[PDB]
Design a protein around this ligand. Sequence first.
Ligand SMILES: Cc1ncc(C[n+]2csc(CCOP(=O)(O)OP(=O)(O)O)c2C)c(N)n1
Ligand SMILES: Cc1ncc(C[n+]2csc(CCOP(=O)(O)OP(=O)(O)O)c2C)c(N)n1
Ligand SMILES: Cc1ncc(C[n+]2csc(CCOP(=O)(O)OP(=O)(O)O)c2C)c(N)n1
Ligand SMILES: [Mg+2]
Ligand SMILES: [Mg+2]
Ligand SMILES: [Mg+2]
Lengths: 546, 546, 546
Amino acid sequence: LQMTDGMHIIVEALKQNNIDTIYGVVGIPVTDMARHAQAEGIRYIGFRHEQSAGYAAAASGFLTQKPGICLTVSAPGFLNGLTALANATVNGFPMIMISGSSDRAIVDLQQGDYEELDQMNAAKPYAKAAFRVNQPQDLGIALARAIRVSVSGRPGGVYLDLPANVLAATMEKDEALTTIVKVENPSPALLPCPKSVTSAISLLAKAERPLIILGKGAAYSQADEQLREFIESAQIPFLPMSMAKGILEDTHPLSAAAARSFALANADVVMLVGARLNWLLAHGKKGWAADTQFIQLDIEPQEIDSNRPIAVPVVGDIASSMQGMLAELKQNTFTTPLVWRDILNIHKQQNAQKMHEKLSTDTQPLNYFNALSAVRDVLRENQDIYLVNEGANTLDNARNIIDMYKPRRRLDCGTWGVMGIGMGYAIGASVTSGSPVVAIEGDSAFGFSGMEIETICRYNLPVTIVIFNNGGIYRGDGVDLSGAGAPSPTDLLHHARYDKLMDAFRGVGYNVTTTDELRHALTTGIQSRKPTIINVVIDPAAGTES
Amino acid sequence: LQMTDGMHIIVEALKQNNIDTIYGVVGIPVTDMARHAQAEGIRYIGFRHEQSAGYAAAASGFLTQKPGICLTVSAPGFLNGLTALANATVNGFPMIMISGSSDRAIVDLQQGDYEELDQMNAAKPYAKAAFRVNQPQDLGIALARAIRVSVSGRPGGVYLDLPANVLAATMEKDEALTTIVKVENPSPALLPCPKSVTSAISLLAKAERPLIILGKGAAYSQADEQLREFIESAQIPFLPMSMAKGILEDTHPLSAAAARSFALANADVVMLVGARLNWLLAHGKKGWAADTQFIQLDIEPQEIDSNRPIAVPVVGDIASSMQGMLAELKQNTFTTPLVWRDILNIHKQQNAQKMHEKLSTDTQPLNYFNALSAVRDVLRENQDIYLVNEGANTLDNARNIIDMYKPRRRLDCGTWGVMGIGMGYAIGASVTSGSPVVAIEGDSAFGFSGMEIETICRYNLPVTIVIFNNGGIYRGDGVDLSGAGAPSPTDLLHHARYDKLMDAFRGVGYNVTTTDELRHALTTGIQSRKPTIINVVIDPAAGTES
Amino acid sequence: LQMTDGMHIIVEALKQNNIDTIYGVVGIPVTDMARHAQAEGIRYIGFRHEQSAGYAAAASGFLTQKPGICLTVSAPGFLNGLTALANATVNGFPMIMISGSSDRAIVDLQQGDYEELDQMNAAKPYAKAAFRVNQPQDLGIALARAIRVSVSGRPGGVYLDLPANVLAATMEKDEALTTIVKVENPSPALLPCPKSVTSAISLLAKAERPLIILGKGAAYSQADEQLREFIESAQIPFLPMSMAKGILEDTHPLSAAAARSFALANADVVMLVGARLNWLLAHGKKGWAADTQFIQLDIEPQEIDSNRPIAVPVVGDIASSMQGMLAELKQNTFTTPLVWRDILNIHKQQNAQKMHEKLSTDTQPLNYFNALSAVRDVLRENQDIYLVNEGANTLDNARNIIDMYKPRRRLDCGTWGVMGIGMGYAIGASVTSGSPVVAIEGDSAFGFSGMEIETICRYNLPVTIVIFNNGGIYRGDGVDLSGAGAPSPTDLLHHARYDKLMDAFRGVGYNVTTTDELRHALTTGIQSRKPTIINVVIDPAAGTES
Ligand SMILES: Cc1ncc(C[n+]2csc(CCOP(=O)(O)OP(=O)(O)O)c2C)c(N)n1
Ligand SMILES: Cc1ncc(C[n+]2csc(CCOP(=O)(O)OP(=O)(O)O)c2C)c(N)n1
Ligand SMILES: Cc1ncc(C[n+]2csc(CCOP(=O)(O)OP(=O)(O)O)c2C)c(N)n1
Ligand SMILES: [Mg+2]
Ligand SMILES: [Mg+2]
Ligand SMILES: [Mg+2]
């Protein structure tokens, strides 16, 4: 009579569901679970802080449509991971945070258990669902629920709570195997109303000035070929939002990225593809035509009419809706007016000339534009990389300047504009893909997760961290207004040498003050596949404060 | 007609209430508030992550009984600070986290505002109270509430939400000044039932084997002289809990710290002073006498009978209760039986001899005992320092070995056993006191807040960080059980040189492999008052795993 | 320039969205809103308690797919309505509860406002969404969101909070009109993956013992003709769950209702149509074959694998799914094994014979069977009624014995087994339909909403309330086990005459003790269309417990 326990059961359930990586920080009561998972051939990546583990998991979910798995301990570790779970739900990235919890009887009486918290209830506001498993025979179905919840609808974080007692709880091994559930097709296709599709095509065909906006839902869908075919067939100008850059290459002739304001102000019919009318699009209000008509492809009927009335909702999974839209277009072809494309190009060209001046003009110290021009030159020759990016000036300028050539290669601060995603996203992207990562980091941004450089060294991951060191938050030229000479609230240490941090962990560091030095250091870093920090000296006065 | 705005009003309210320090991370919508606070002579300390800002604030509250102030931005920064606010409430440390929030109208409709979150409601589970201020004329009374709530009863975290619009909202300056509220005596004395006090003394006087346990409520109360007088008058053996070490010096002849198990198993009457029967005391169950009778001094009547029935509750603020207890003892003196003290001393001596062997026996590599013996030798000569401590082996062994000579000088992982409090507590303690800090840090523990070494350098704070580098969580000799040769879930990088991190920020680093080297490096670090990291090479096999 | 205010704007928005009835209880700050809605041609129905108003709104939603509107005041009224909102969400019935709230500034500071509560946050755990409107120009979009959310996915309750200030807030009339949103097609069709449809048909065609279960979702969908055609085409036995009775008439040859236990114990393939594997189906565990394979038609992907692994999820709206299932069956026809249908029929006849004996045997006093047989005699002759039903014995027996002939005519205690839905569901059904209602009520059940008989009288609604008066909860023969002779916890007043309650409100009352009296009284009630109570004297010892 062979016995097993809850810990072995949950590991087997993860294995059967093709989980091959767990991102976490161990401790009571989950250390043995991690060790056993690794024994069973799951890759374990241990972090310096759970929030970076959670960011890594969500990145892996965005890239793959399989929920990333984040493992934490009870209360103190759980709360750190929860901050990341919250971010995944806001952004629409599938992940499951699995946390140990303490003694249900003691916690339910608030008697002061070890790491006491009702973690299930704590996670509820920040997750698509929060489940807690009390019986080992329910672990398999619980994981099945968590997987389906995380990837169905608009994807997001799910919390799965494993009390210490369920991990230790025993059952007969043969019976235990019958309770494990392998989920086939956890996010089934949901097809739109055919009438919606016909109405959408008809409205586009009548448009004088149609515009498609590709949002991160579009990128997540992996409908890359359908989106490109639709756009090129009808020659419809498009605006890629940050993490949608690269679905079509950013150099594509139909991209209106360089005339964004003109496009939003003048488009008459706008087709949102997995793009919400939230603050990133000014809620469809400021800067938009008074009477824009919207077509909206979104999986969530609850998102329709959230901000502006939507003329033609196309509710369904984006891949299925794009298949329908393409089929309807084939039967009822149209071509966007050439005049609209031509006038867009006038505006794009005006801005391109202004950008080109900034990119190509040398300054000492460096500014954002000439530094990022050097980065742009290198990355153009290394189109296999993933790009992670966070900061304020460092974020907005890199978003504009660094062209993405392939889809789902850009990961950034996202909908909540979180500083602290940089190292976790780099680790998640590198582990998931096996590809090199370049992280373009504000100096303040980097400080939120910088201890993870040891994690990067520990697993010898090919991450090149390029820190835009302007000596502060937005700018480094702040002054203490009291006259006391203290650092201002936005100042960081003058001339910190972040490259030297790598010396602690046997990584590589470069300090750079010119575009030639930056180009060399970045090329060498990427080619070397060694963990590398490049400290870029940026003019403290170059940035603007939002 | 001179006008002012909400931002100026809240700064003036903080000033009038003797807030002289704010710990935070700025960004929209609070940067100008921080700059203006600093203009007005409030010291601003900016962190690399809000959780360390929040830990600093709570430390300052524990040391002073004045709530520490933590300032954050909206959603992403707020959530990071919230993790620390939660910790303050659990531990009983007064603090106020002030966060900017976004547009109430947009957030209430869930339309996707910039940094959208109902932060007030989010903070409610983790705070004594959560307030949100919509009108500038209510800022003064709101701050008054927050101060009184944070320090009254059992102290804890309070959340104060300032929507961006209230900061910008204007009012006439003279009228505005009339709405500012200076709180006098925000935590008034609450005196116990005199019958409780008489019953407590009577029970102690009948005890064969009485024991006092001093908890962090005792330390917080600053009733140092009354506690010492009571203990010495009746010669009552006492057990200091971690953050109560030093109320009486740890070398005091009545301390039963070195016979803890014997004391708990054999005491007949136990007087808890600001000490909960939670997991840290095994809930008064395992390891206790079957029929212990409890006296409990606590400010919270809701804590009485939480775990074991309490024979004599003494409900009131600990300082007031100790004044009553001392007065009642003076009228009805007794002396603890000498036999009980003598048999305690037998057991203390048995353990002292075992400890002394471990402390004084050289090993290569170093172990926890001989390394901490070197630390003990230095700290005995530097009794003006604050000691911050976190880890597992690093925590438990330092707690046992490093004697505290003065009260409220030890700050550690606390009731939730949080890793990540080390740098924030060191910064809070240093800024508050103007004294040197020694942080004795596990290598895993340090990784949770290690980027704050730049903060320490930026403000040139006299913090010596001693990292017990055993190469992992508990131990550094883990193995990948799959045979693939990957780092085990508990391993960190082999032979990381954390001392080299200081090179980035112009701090000082020492690497040490012997007790002589450690003693020298630690003495020099403390005397120098320079930001310093000491990397201590500890045997990877020395630690135990809980 | 002509002005308007929030109150006028929201009424106009309700009108434009074809809201023609509001169910409510007035008071500050919503009385004028109700007066004006009524002025504008909306039918106002005022209740004696908000819980019944909310039940009425949810009933109307179930019957129509248009959310019922419940209107309440702030805290005390809001909380009463919330209990009903919670029930709507659990059951999947669309409704919007609109509540006034107090002063956001005062409530956010917890200063003790008039009827102070954060109502939006209070409603969140019980609603699909909770929205709060601060600006009158956002009232139209807020209502548009509330409508869409309430009827999409699995339908449910939405809370819409209107602070007193928004109702009073003014704007220019013409501009205000441009902010009103008329929602077209609030729940668009969502079609299932074609492969899942083909898989479902394939599995059914291979089944030896297939069974369809029709749940409330099937009833709500209004796919009556598609369901009938599918069932009849393949001759698939079906089980109607309570509120799905009548989709096909309960006397249909293929109904397995009279062999329910045998059918669940023996089916090999079970097709759930808008039916959860919750407690009502014993979670697919107790009473089921060990290896049942499930097809599940549900709109909510989060419901799949909640309890038992589901072999063939068919995710999409039920009407759309059934259209696809029907089309696929046509291309791939099959006939359910005759042997299976025959065996079911053997079991059905045996239970029908046992039923007939209980039904046809007269007793004094009446029992549940002969009383309900009398009721069925009358309802057989009066088929255009609505049936409301609640109780324990009164519920289970009426569910079994009263055949439904048409869909969406039965309303009962539902998924949470709530006592107190009877009067509200009766009012909602009669107001919505214009048809007579028969409410078959346990005497305890009736007590939960009994004051609403005045409401029934006030609006002269054709409701006949048939109270099964057995003198208590389950039974009326309880004894005080102390010997003191007090009523037992399940006893109600011996021989209460509920019919006399109607005297207070000029309604009609009958007391009945025999089947003949019962038949006459019920026939007269229905045909008179007068508010009527029939007090039915039931044997206190007839019922069973639990
Ligand atoms: C967790 C978190 N805390 C605070 C903020 C506020 N914030 C916005 S940008 C920013 C950093 C800006 O400085 P940096 O990253 O150095 O970029 P720069 O503009 O200097 O290039 C911060 C802290 C945030 N977005 N997230
Ligand atoms: C925020 C948080 N995450 C995880 C844990 C679990 N945990 C307990 S001790 C510990 C670290 C132990 O290693 P270390 O600090 O290096 O001390 P050592 O025992 O090796 O001396 C961790 C991560 C925790 N307590 N808090
Ligand atoms: C709001 C609410 N309170 C309590 C219950 C528990 N409960 C179940 S059935 C029932 C009443 C049973 O008696 P009755 O309605 O008279 O029917 P009978 O069995 O006597 O025919 C009650 C109170 C409930 N379901 N809902
Ligand atoms: Mg910067
Ligand atoms: Mg360690
Ligand atoms: Mg009854």
